[PDB]
Design an enzyme around this catalytic site. Structure first.
Site, PDB file in Angstrom:
ATOM      1  CG  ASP A  77      -5.805   2.032  12.049  1.00 33.26           C
ATOM      2  OD1 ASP A  77      -5.330   3.228  12.687  1.00 33.26           O
ATOM      3  OD2 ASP A  77      -5.276   1.092  11.955  1.00 33.26           O
TER       4      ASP A  77
ATOM      5  CG  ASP B  25      -1.020  -1.921  11.380  1.00 28.54           C
ATOM      6  OD1 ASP B  25      -0.471  -3.381  11.226  1.00 28.54           O
ATOM      7  OD2 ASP B  25      -2.012  -2.240  12.361  1.00 28.54           O
TER       8      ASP B  25
ATOM      9  CD1 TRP C 273       1.732  -8.853  11.326  1.00 28.40           C
ATOM     10  CD2 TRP C 273       1.624  -7.171  12.824  1.00 28.40           C
ATOM     11  NE1 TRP C 273       2.100  -9.454  12.576  1.00 28.40           N
ATOM     12  CE2 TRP C 273       2.204  -8.356  13.476  1.00 28.40           C
ATOM     13  CE3 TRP C 273       1.583  -5.970  13.421  1.00 28.40           C
ATOM     14  CZ2 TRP C 273       2.561  -8.454  14.912  1.00 28.40           C
ATOM     15  CZ3 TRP C 273       1.916  -6.018  14.877  1.00 28.40           C
ATOM     16  CH2 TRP C 273       2.449  -7.170  15.171  1.00 28.40           C
TER      17      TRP C 273
ATOM     18  CB  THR D  24      -5.982   5.307  15.142  1.00 19.88           C
ATOM     19  OG1 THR D  24      -5.980   5.655  13.815  1.00 19.88           O
ATOM     20  CG2 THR D  24      -7.052   5.900  16.007  1.00 19.88           C
TER      21      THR D  24
ATOM     22  CD1 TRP E  23      -4.279  -2.923  21.103  1.00 15.37           C
ATOM     23  CD2 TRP E  23      -4.870  -3.681  19.240  1.00 15.37           C
ATOM     24  NE1 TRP E  23      -3.644  -3.654  21.068  1.00 15.37           N
ATOM     25  CE2 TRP E  23      -3.859  -4.559  20.109  1.00 15.37           C
ATOM     26  CE3 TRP E  23      -4.978  -4.408  18.160  1.00 15.37           C
ATOM     27  CZ2 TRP E  23      -3.252  -5.603  19.720  1.00 15.37           C
ATOM     28  CZ3 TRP E  23      -4.578  -5.512  17.472  1.00 15.37           C
ATOM     29  CH2 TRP E  23      -3.692  -6.204  18.447  1.00 15.37           C
ATOM     30  CG  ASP E  24      -5.897   1.644  16.398  1.00 11.51           C
ATOM     31  OD1 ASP E  24      -5.026   1.700  17.263  1.00 11.51           O
ATOM     32  OD2 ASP E  24      -5.593   1.665  15.007  1.00 11.51           O
TER      33      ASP E  24
HETATM   34 CA   LIG Z   1      -3.612   1.800  13.799  1.00 11.63          CA
HETATM   35 NI    NI Z   2      -3.216  -1.499  15.604  1.00 11.89          NI
END
Ligand SMILES: [Ca+2]
Ligand code: NI
Ligand SMILES: [Ca+2]
Ligand code: NI
Ligand code: NI
Ligand code: NI
Ligand code: NI
Ligand code: NI
Ligand code: NI
Ligand code: NI
Ligand code: NI
Lengths: 325, 322
Positions: A18, A43, A86, A140, A263-264
């Site tokens: 993020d 997250d 996480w 995200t 990812w994001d």
């Molecule tokens: Ca995220």
């Molecule tokens: Ni993630």
């Protein structure tokens, strides 16, 4: 005709991916006018994700004179929580030296109380609806805040959205939610709140660009790439992203993932360079049941699924952006 | 005057803070070699980090280069696998990939690859003009090997041995289905080695056990202090490492992250940082639940009551060096 920045809001959940997305948006004011950030307790633990958002905002304001903006903590609650282990990353990031530069601490301490008053969902609704130009929302984390806005305000909100660029799902590939009660077909952002994902993705009045695992699994972050930040260590953003990617690759070794993935950060990359990927229009179901396939997004309005993202363009974009300051 | 020192370490974040403390203080410490053991790391990664830190400090403050050797000592009881990846992670960090340092290490690495760690420790101590202080922040296996092979030819050239290890009056930290929680990790890794070294009357041992180390926690409020010093490479390094360390103890439900190995180096720099109690110890070398325990029974000198403020002051001063 090509000279105006896009108006953007970042709707995030506070992990390393993020914040790479956030840095990508904020470091590129010629392309992106960042008018707000929303943080969700998904997250991350929301208080930590909020503080890291604020420090990054203040650091960029100091270094490159990007505007300050409202930041709001969402009160959205999980259907299915992220794994506890996480969620401590933002806490760890808020102890890092690059996020404790004394001027940034001083300015954020001053601005924090005014931002504390914001409700995240309502801030998203307000920023979109008062905006002169249509707004791009970069999502995200989970889709709960967008769903809330659609529910409360409907077209009064959606008619002011240019498009929604979203990290979520898995269409033609496997998922990444591996629990005793799941089958591994779902992706995390969707699984966190499946009915929210269904409300947003199925709404014909909002254009959704979807970065699912199909795209994001083709852009791994490897040691050889992370080590490239050393050559740029004089720049604060290279210290930040280098460190965050190093931390991330380590997590995937410890968790036995095939790799860490951009990812994001790819959602933000797309906003900066929309030719980075091609789009496939696809009708999706979203599984909202309580079965083993909860949160699955299989093929069934059309969602626009990102396909075949350029690794080289992403690399070039991240390395140039992190030399900004 | 500077003390002649060797660091005999096992490659985690606490070991590298200790290394930084030694190497950033050339007025007080002449660091003539480093040994790395495959205990709280994978030895190849621990080796590379040692090299990069050496090269960075050479570049920035002109500290001498020195030989570095990988020990071939093997574990009796291995560290948990998930803890041993830290050195690998550090080697990806941007402060350890400054291009000049990467380049110098690629040149010096092959010359150091030839060294056997145990033999290097013996050789450095035995050829040294002055007596040498050995700072031991991993297990005692290399010191034991040297005593075994060379006896008094080695020990007569050791000034003193400053060791991270044990728990005398307090609980241990080795929590497994086959243990009782009374033992500390460095000792547990190789208990017979510890017994050989701690019980040798011809070597003077200063022992930083959990009794001392568990009184010097590293808390968020402290770690955040490195932000004020981020222009210094050593502050980016130590800040990041301690941030990572405090995180590990959150995940693992520890009461705190502790200075640990960094206190041995602190003691070498400022011996008044702690008082010393002479104590006769047993070392439990059995295969029972108490394997590796160091209960009260020659006298080992056990560190007591270390100054948190002196430690803090020393770490912050040292990390403004470059
Ligand atoms: Ca995220
Ligand atoms: Ni993630
Ligand atoms: Ca150690
Ligand atoms: Ni234009
Ligand atoms: Ni306000
Ligand atoms: Ni490149
Ligand atoms: Ni340790
Ligand atoms: Ni030189
Ligand atoms: Ni040699
Ligand atoms: Ni816990
Ligand atoms: Ni202080």
């Amino acid at each position: 005709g090509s000279h105006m920045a896009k108006t953007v809001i970042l709707d995030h959940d506070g992990n390393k991916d993020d914040f790479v997305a956030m840095i990508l948006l904020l470091s590129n004011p010629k392309k992106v006018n960042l008018i707000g950030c929303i943080c969700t307790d998904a997250d991350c633990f929301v208080e930590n994700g909020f503080d890291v958002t604020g420090k990054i905002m203040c650091a960029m304001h100091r270094l490159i004179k990007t505007p300050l903006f409202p930041i709001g903590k969402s009160t959205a609650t999980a259907v299915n929580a992220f794994p506890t282990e996480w969620r401590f990353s933002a806490k760890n990031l808020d102890d890092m030296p690059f996020l404790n530069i004394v001027e940034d601490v001083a300015l954020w301490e001053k601005l924090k109380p005014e931002n504390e008053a914001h409700n995240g969902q309502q801030l998203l609704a307000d920023l979109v609806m008062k905006s002169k130009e249509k707004v791009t929302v970069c999502v995200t984390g989970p889709l709960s805040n967008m769903a809330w806005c659609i529910e409360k305000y409907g077209e009064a909100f959606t008619s002011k959205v240019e498009e929604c660029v979203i990290m979520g799902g898995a269409v033609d590939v496997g998922g990444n939610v591996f629990l005793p009660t799941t089958d591994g077909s779902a992706e995390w952002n969707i699984y966190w709140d499946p009915p929210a994902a269904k409300k947003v993705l199925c709404c014909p009045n909002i254009r959704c660009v979807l970065f699912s695992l199909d795209a994001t699994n083709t852009v791994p972050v490897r040691s050889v790439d992370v080590k490239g930040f050393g050559a740029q260590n004089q720049y604060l953003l290279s210290q930040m992203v280098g460190t965050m990617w190093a931390m991330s690759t380590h997590e995937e070794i410890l968790r036995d993932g095939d790799a860490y993935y951009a990812w994001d950060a790819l959602t933000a990359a797309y906003i900066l360079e929309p030719t980075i990927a091609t789009l496939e229009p696809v009708a999706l179901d979203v599984d909202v049941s309580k079965g083993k396939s909860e949160g699955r997004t299989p093929r069934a309005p059309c969602v626009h699924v990102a396909r075949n993202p350029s690794k080289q363009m992403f690399h070039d974009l991240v390395f140039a952006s992190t030399r900004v300051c």
